[PDB]
Amino acid sequence: PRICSKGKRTVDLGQCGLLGTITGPPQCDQFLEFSADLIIERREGSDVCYPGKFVN
Amino acid sequence: SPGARTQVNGQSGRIDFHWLMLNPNDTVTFSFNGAFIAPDRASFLRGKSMGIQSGV
Amino acid sequence: EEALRQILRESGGIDKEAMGFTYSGIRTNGATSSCRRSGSSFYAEMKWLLSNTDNAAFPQMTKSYKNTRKNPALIVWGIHHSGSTAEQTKLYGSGNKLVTVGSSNYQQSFVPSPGARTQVNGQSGRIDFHWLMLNPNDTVTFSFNGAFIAPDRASFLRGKSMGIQSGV
Amino acid sequence: RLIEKTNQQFELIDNEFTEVEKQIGNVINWTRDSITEVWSYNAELLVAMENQHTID
Ligand SMILES: *[C@@H]1O[C@H](CO)[C@@H](O[C@@H]2O[C@H](CO)[C@@H](O)[C@H](O)[C@H]2NC(C)=O)[C@H](O)[C@H]1NC(C)=O
């Protein structure tokens, strides 16, 4: 019941989304230049801080 | 398109992010008259990896 | 249309809840010869919004609907493209028209395009219908300047089912 | 022969947290149901074959 990751780099995006890593909200300040072999998205992650969305 | 919308996060205005994948040598041009959110920095892919979604 | 057809195939039926949407000053009946319940009529579930008289100004209005049930809502509105720019000045008056639809996860802009088309059912003007699937508690906002076909009632899914196509 | 699993790497094609367009989502769901029907039939057939061949 927990994500097994040994020897592979892992980024846990708590409160951050994958699309937020490009635009950079305050919730995604740590992962602006992130690097990993395994990326984990959470349900709590929000992509935008000002109301909006990503086309495609 | 200026118009009244529902209130999310205390702001009625909304924002759309659009993306392109530029080619190893291609020139992108941004001729705008306003309502433009310019990128500060580009984004470049690093390698390969996988992406998962979980809550554990 | 195909995604909405797939939704309505596994709809199991549709439940209608009255979207209030009171309008002041402007007419809201609508009349066309091609669409006949008896004499001249429009869609039963959609309301055509015209000016009070011909060649008159259309006031800008914002109408909002709130979702109160625990199931997703189906909201279908319409955008009218006139058969000519003279017909658009006759129905809605002069000036550019803009319809803005707002939601938590939906936003889209519509501009009507007056132009001559081929004659289908005796009418040169044409109508688009656009749809969204509202969330168990999302507020949809319809800020329009004209060329808007407002829904009379929402649509709510009932259960599960299947949809087939046959001629027997 | 049987215990060894695949080396093919599969990605996410559906966001569980946020829904995909409903046309390509229905196409993806139909394809996944057809694929798992094929694999379930192959699994039942393989188990029956190897049990019968072991007894014989
Ligand atoms: C495709 O199938 C998935 C299930 O495999 C559907 O996802 C479920 O959607 C319902 C709402 O309709 C949720 O209550 C479930 O929690 C979802 N399950 C999972 C595992 O995510 C999905 O809706 C289907 N897509 C379409 C377009 O019908």
Ligand SMILES: *[C@@H]1O[C@H](CO)[C@@H](O)[C@H](O)[C@H]1NC(C)=O
């Ligand atoms: C390639 O990049 C250079 C400068 O970085 C630019 O001047 C040139 O126009 C680019 N070429 C193309 C084909 O876009």
Ligand SMILES: *[C@@H]1O[C@H](CO)[C@@H](O)[C@H](O)[C@H]1NC(C)=O
């Ligand atoms: C959600 O439902 C409540 C039920 O009381 C309603 O008052 C509200 O306006 C609805 N809309 C929102 C805030 O999404």
